[PDB]
Each structure stands twice: as structure tokens, then as C-alpha cells.
Amino acid sequence: MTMPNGSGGLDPGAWLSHWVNQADLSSLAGRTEDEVRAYFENLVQADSGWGDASNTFFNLILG
């Protein structure tokens, strides 16, 4: 379970790669409801398929 290389053994594209702690343990207390909610609301707003559907609905279908 050891990585002979350094931080390069981690996978940056993993699902929970943003939440793997290396030395920033002060951020653990910042994982409350509000901050996680804001992060995931930002992701959902940035979601691409829903945005394309919004463009199609409001620009094409609705003129």
C-alpha cells in the first residue's frame, strides 16, 4: 500500500482526488454542510449537458 514514487502515485482524475489530504489538515474542519454544498452547487452549475439543454430550450425552442 506504499507508493515508491512521491505524490505522483496518486491519480488526479479520481472521483475523490480533491479530498485526499497531504499536509493541509486544517481543511478537515472546513468540510461542513455549507462549503461542500457550495462546491457541489458550483459543479452542478458547471455541468455541460444541462447547460446545452438550457441553450437549446431557451434559444432554439423558445426563440
Binding site: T2, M3, P4, L10, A14, L25, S26, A29, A53, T56
Partner: protein
């Protein structure tokens, strides 16, 4: 530094007198070593403070001659049970028997057994006692669990810095870093949480300048000492993940892969002992436990260590060389070995084995001070390992809901369901759950080369954390390859050998051993020490003085069937808990 000329002058030019002086000095050193080896242990019982404060309170002392029998094993990263049999007329036996029904006493008792004046210590909590009758003669058999069992009852939640029944985000907790620092940091974070999460966690717990000096840690019963993230000299990193998993189960794979050792010491400040190197190390109370991750094998170090040797030229230094992807590690011998000796080897009174320079080789021949019970070797089994299941980065339920419903709505608004002309954009993701990049297969080229044409092919390995391989692909593959490897284990019993366990050699420290068998007389099997049990029996029928039995190296193959079943059951129970907690509700 008495030179030969000085000794001769003191002896008035008589070479025989001077050499007799030198021989007397050598004899007194040998006698000191023998007295240290044959010294009686110091068994002491301590209790919690009846008023409920901190600091263990001295109950009493059991005499070695007043024992009936005893057995105390020290194991590498494994909890062990200590057994002490007393006569029921013994005062500590009477105290222990009255303890359950005494309302003025706390129910937890700590045993401390000191060898070599406290240099080696076996400390542990009471597990139980039993009143046993041998031919109408009653005696108290008292069983203790060594102080590594605390790591079974310490567990890591997904967010150790927040209240548990409120919000534990993310689903699993993952910490990556140097191996020793990360293991120690996981243990410390859980210790902080269970002591109350009273203060704010700094970025690096072991950066001692981050902690305030006004803070009081005296109420802590357990501490962890480690270097900081930047100052840690662990060559390899590690990724530890947990969803309410026990700490020992979390760290077992990393400890095995990095060949690290957990050392526990119960600081008896009543004996004058002190501690340093961790937050609040100056105000710790009597009998507080301290953990430390150490590299006693030094296998991953830059200079390497000794992996083999022969009785005619000593040990041979090798260094680990990592292949493509760092999954595979082989040994390359240092042809011109020029590693300097440790400075400790030049200090008077030193006896320990430094990790960088192993020295202890235990030879078996016609005239041997030890007895070799059994030496077993077995080749590696499976060339390839498969680890996986589902890959959340591709088919997480949040993705399967949000992204797929958005794509379907876009297709619908474009008119795909009215007529098939429209080109869709991933509207079939829920149909392919567990199929896209859901596995990792690695074939061990070195293992295949060592094994040959006829070999076992592959093995599926499930990690301690079921959904962490995507976070650490390399760590998952190495943990999977930890299973079916070449295994050598040797059992020794040191009857009257000059070797002093704990002093000359410690748990996790490499040592060589030989067996007087034709064809392997010259060969030295070099294994890191894994077990050593000190046992004695004072019974009139069979009387065995305090003797040490060592087990160097480990092997799942030569492990007894009962022990194999117990280990498998423990792993199965932990995996079942992990799967049950990873279940998605309907």
C-alpha cells in the same frame, strides 16, 4: 584508552601479566552481559485512579519466584496476549479477585513487565482472569492484551475533525504522504478526535511550532511521536483510506509494504522516565502510552541493507530497484559496499542493532547455543493480480443521475425521441455501470521470471478499503502483490545463547540465521525479526527458566491452520463491515 605500552608499563614489562589484565577485563564484560541476560523480570500491576483523574496508580509487584508460570510475546504489528499464573494466596491475585466486586476501584488494570532494567517492556491492559482448579488446588490465570490492541478500538471516520452523527464528508477519508508521517498522522488525528477535538488542528500536527504552548495534553492517555511532513525521511509514500475502519486494519498493508514497525512504550514517570518529540510530551502522566513508527528493517533506504549472506563472508548489501510503474521491486547487490559504520557502534555499552548495519547472525551447527525448531521456505504463487470492481470516476451515482438526465433532456429538446436523426451525447451511461475502466491487472514480470514456465496465473485481491484503488492505483496493486510472495520463516529457541533479545536485537530488525542442514550450511537466511516470546514455568513437575523463542520472517504457508483461520476471519469481518457501510440504500 589504555594502550598496549601503557598496560605493559603498568604490569612492569610482563607480557603475561598484561595479557591476564586484558583477559580479566574481557571476562568482567562477559560476566556483565551474562548477568544482564539472566536478570529476573520486574512484574508490576498498576490501576486507574479511583477518583477518576489521570495517571496510573501503583497497585503492587509480583515476584518472579512467586509466579507459577508466565508467557509474554512481542510481535511485529500484531496484538499479543500475555499470560500470568499466580497462586490464589498471592496478594496481587487476591486484589485482582476482589477487583470486580470492589466499588471503590476502577475495573481496568495495567501490567508492566520489565526486562533488563526496563529497557524491554511488555505493558498491557487486563483481558480477564480465571480461577482454575488443578487437583483441588486453585490458581488465578490472568490474561492481558498488549498495548497494540488500542489500535483495534481506534477507528478513523470519514471526517475525524467534525461531529460524526451530523455530516461525515467525503464518503471516505484519504491521507497521502511519507509512510511514517501518514500512519502517525492518521493515528494522531483519531486520538485528537477521541480526546474531544477540543482545539483546532494545524496543517501538520507534528510541526511542533504550530501547537500553542499553553495547551494541556496531560489528560491524553495515548500519544503519537513523529517527524513533520517535510522532515520525514521515509523514502516511499503511502495512501491510507478509511470509512470507519479500525486504524490497525487501515495501516497493516502500508506497514507490511514499507517494512515499518509500530513501537509502543508506556512512560512510567514514577520511575523517572520522560518523553519528548510529540505535542505535550512534557506534561504526560504516569503510564501514558506513546506510539512511534520506525524503520527497523531499512529495506527501502537509499543505501539499502543486508538481504542475504554466507557464513564465510558475512552479509551482502543490496538496494531496491523499482521497475516500470514502481509496482515491482528487485534487489541489486552493491559490489563495492562502502557504507560507514554507525556512530553508536563506537560507543561503550552499546548493544542494539542499527537498521543501516545489521550484524547479528545466529549459527546452528553441532555445537550451537540455540535450538532451531523449523526453517520453511516457499516460492511465490501468482504472477498477476487483479484489483477493481467499480470505478466511481466513470459511473458514480451522482454522475449517473445528473449528467445522464441532462444529456437525455438535451436529446429530447433537440428531438431525438421524435426521430432518430439526432446524435446523442452519452445517454447510455447507466447501462455501463462497472464496465468502463473498472479493473487494474498487473503481471509481475520479476515473479514470472523467478517462477518459470509452470506457474499459477492470477489472483483477485480486494483491498482493506473497497473503493480506494481508483484513488491510489499503485498502492492497490502493491497491496495486492503483498499476498502471494516468496516466504521464509525460521523458529529459534535461545536457551543459553549470548544473544539478548530486545537488547541485541529488536522486533522488526533484520538478522541472519543458519541451519545445520546439508546444502545450506553456508547460506544465511536474513529475515527481520517478527516474534519473540519470553516464557517461564515455576511448577514443581516441569520447571522452565525464563527462556526466549524467536521467529524471524513470516509465512502464510507455514502458519498454523488455527492462526490462518483466525486471520482470515478477522479480514473477512473487516471487509464485511466495509461493504455493509458502502451499501447504497434503496
Amino acid at each position: 584508552a589504555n594502550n598496549w605500552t601503557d598496560i605493559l608499563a603498568a604490569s612492569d614489562g610482563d607480557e603475561w601479566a598484561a595479557f591476564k589484565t586484558i583477559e580479566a577485563q574481557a571476562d568482567e564484560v562477559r560476566a556483565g552481559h551474562q548477568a544482564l541476560r539472566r536478570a529476573k523480570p520486574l512484574i508490576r500491576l498498576w490501576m486507574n485512579n479511583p477518583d477518576g483523574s489521570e495517571g496510573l496508580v501503583y497497585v503492587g509487584r509480583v515476584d518472579y519466584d512467586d509466579t507459577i508460570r508466565g508467557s509474554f510475546p512481542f510481535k511485529n504489528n500484531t496484538p499479543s496476549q500475555g499470560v500470568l499464573e499466580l497462586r490464589d494466596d498471592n496478594y496481587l491475585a487476591v486484589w485482582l479477585k476482589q477487583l470486580p466486586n470492589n466499588p471503590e476501584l476502577k475495573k481496568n488494570v495495567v501490567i508492566t513487565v520489565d526486562f533488563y532494567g526496563g529497557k524491554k517492556r511488555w505493558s498491557g491492559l487486563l483481558d480477564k482472569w480465571t480461577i482454575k482448579s488443578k487437583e483441588h488446588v486453585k490458581y488465578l490465570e490472568v490474561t492481558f492484551n498488549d498495548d497494540l490492541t488500542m489500535l483495534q478500538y481506534l477507528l478513523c471516520p470519514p471526517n475525524p475533525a467534525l461531529p460524526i452523527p451530523v455530516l461525515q464528508f467525503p464518503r471516505i477519508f484519504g491521507i497521502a504522504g511519507p509512510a511514517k508521517w501518514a500512519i502517525s498522522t492518521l493515528i494522531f488525528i483519531n486520538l485528537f478526535r477521541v480526546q474531544g477535538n477540543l482545539w483546532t488542528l494545524p496543517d501538520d500536527p507534528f510541526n511542533l511550532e504550530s501547537w500553542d504552548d499553553i495547551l494541556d495534553w496531560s489528560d491524553w492517555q495515548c500519544f503519537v511521536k513523529s517527524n513533520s511532513f517535510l522532515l520525514d525521511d521515509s523514502s516511499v509514500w503511502t495512501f491510507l483510506s478509511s470509512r470507519m475502519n479500525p486504524v490497525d486494519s487501515i495501516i497493516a498493508d502500508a506497514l507490511d509494504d514499507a517494512q515499518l514497525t509500530i513501537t509502543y512504550r508506556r512512560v512510567l514517570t514514577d520511575d523517572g522516565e520522560t518523553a519528548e518529540g510529540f505535542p505535550g510530551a512534557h506534561g504526560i502522566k504516569n503510564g501514558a502510552l506513546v506510539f512511534e513508527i520506525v524503520d527497523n528493517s531499512n529495506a527501502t533506504a537509499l543505501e539499502g541493507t543486508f538481504f542475504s549472506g554466507t557464513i564465510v563472508d558475512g552479509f551482502a548489501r543490496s538496494v531496491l530497484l523499482y521497475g516500470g510503474g514502481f509496482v515491482e521491486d528487485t534487489l541489486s547487490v552493491v559490489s563495492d559496499d562502502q557504507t560507514l559504520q554507525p556512530d553508536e557502534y563506537y560507543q561503550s555499552g552499546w548493544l542494539a542493532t542499527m537498521a543501516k548495519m545489521p550484524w547479528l547472525v545466529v549459527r546452528d551447527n553441532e555445537w550451537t547455543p540455540i535450538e532451531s525448531s523449523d526453517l520453511s521456505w516457499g516460492p511465490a504463487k501468482n504472477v498477476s493480480v487483479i484489483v477493481g470492481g467499480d470505478n466511481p470516476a466513470a459511473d458514480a451515482i451522482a454522475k449517473l443521475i445528473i449528467e445522464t438526465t441532462g444529456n437525455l433532456l438535451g436529446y429530447f429538446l433537440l428531438g431525438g425521441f421524435s426521430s432518430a436523426g439526432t446524435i446523442a451525447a452519452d445517454i447510455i451511461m447507466p447501462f455501463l455501470v462497472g464496465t468502463i475502466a473498472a479493473w487494474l491487472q498487473w503481471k509481475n514480470t520479476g515473479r514470472a521470471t523467478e517462477l518459470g514456465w509452470v506457474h499459477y496465473w492470477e489472483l483477485y485481491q480486494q483491498g482493506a478499503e473497497t473503493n480506494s484503488w481508483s484513488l491510489a492505483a499503485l498502492a492497490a496493486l502493491r497491496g495486492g502483490f503483498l499476498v502471494g510472495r516468496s516466504e521464509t520463516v525460521h523458529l529459534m529457541a535461545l536457551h543459553d545463547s549470548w544473544i539478548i533479545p530486545g537488547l541485541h536485537i529488536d522486533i522488526g530488525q533484520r538478522m541472519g540465521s543458519t541451519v545445520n542442514s546439508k546444502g545450506v550450511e553456508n547460506i544465511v537466511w536474513v529475515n527481520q525479526l517478527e516474534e519473540m516470546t519470553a516464557a517461564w514455568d515455576n511448577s514443581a513437575g516441569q520447571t522452565m527458566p525464563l527462556s526466549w523463542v524467536l521467529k524471524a520472517g513470516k509465512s502464510d504457508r507455514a502458519m498454523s491452520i488455527g492462526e490462518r483461520v483466525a486471520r482470515l476471519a478477522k479480514k473477512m469481518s473487516e471487509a464485511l463491515n466495509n461493504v455493509g457501510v458502502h451499501i447504497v440504500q434503496s
